[PDB]
Amino acid sequence: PSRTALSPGVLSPTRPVPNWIARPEYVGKPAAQEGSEPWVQTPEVIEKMRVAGRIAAGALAEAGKAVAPGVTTDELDRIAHEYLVDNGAYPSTLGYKGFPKSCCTSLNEVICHGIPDSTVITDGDIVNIDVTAYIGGVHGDTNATFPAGDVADEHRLLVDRTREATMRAINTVKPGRALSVIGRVIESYANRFGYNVVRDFTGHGIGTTFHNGLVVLHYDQPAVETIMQPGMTFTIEPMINLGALDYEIWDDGWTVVTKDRKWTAQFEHTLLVTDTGVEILTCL
């Protein structure tokens, strides 16, 4: 048997960031200035995005190494926060539209945007950690779902097949291809197992802004005409559900849960379209 439905916990105090680490402009503001930026980045921006991406990947991997029964989601946030700040990076989530922590922790039925808190991870859980770094005036965004203890076969396979859907989508990225191939590959692969691909939350372009206005759909919609071109940077971040797509948001305004409480898994990388294919910017 696995645990029952989750409920929210208490948050730790706000974690500070040294003043010499520049903040994204949206920290301390009610909204973010994003969504109208170019989709192809300059070579100087891309080089800085490699640095941001590798730092985010390191924070993700260090917090992921700590996932085990008995650990709180707050303790994962502390690890990610300190990794970023020791690397001179600001955690992009912290202060984005008032989000109170440095990463998102989404267990089990939480589709995305779970808030690190007193919640204790237990055996059988699947834990998504989502970390973004802001450094050099650019962002790097990545997430992964990590098993805690011995996970039930249905949940283990959900995580492994979500990871594989993500990698197959990444491996389609090439200049001249339609962006819509990403969602076609994810949803074709998920539908083999009878999983449902979340639609309402998407991948996105990323650069000097966190969400630049480019949308990357994870389901199949061949009417989108956008093509991949060298220098475009975006995330692929599919959420895949064992149950129905219907969802609720907690009173915290962030945490998104499946209405049937069936579990869901996600992986994310920030990608660069190169002249021949793709480069993952959020690798160690």
Ligand SMILES: CO[C@@H](C(=O)NCCOc1c(C)cc(C)cc1C)[C@H](O)[C@@H](O)[C@H](O)/C=C/C(C)(C)C
């Ligand atoms: C699944 O979650 C992704 C997500 O919301 N996509 C939808 C992005 O919608 C847009 C689009 C499509 C355009 C603009 C201009 C702005 C937004 C938020 C995130 O990008 C996630 O990867 C990120 O780590 C977390 C960010 C906050 C918790 C701080 C929000």
Ligand SMILES: [Mn+2]
């Ligand atoms: Mn993310």
Ligand SMILES: [Mn+2]
């Ligand atoms: Mn993202």
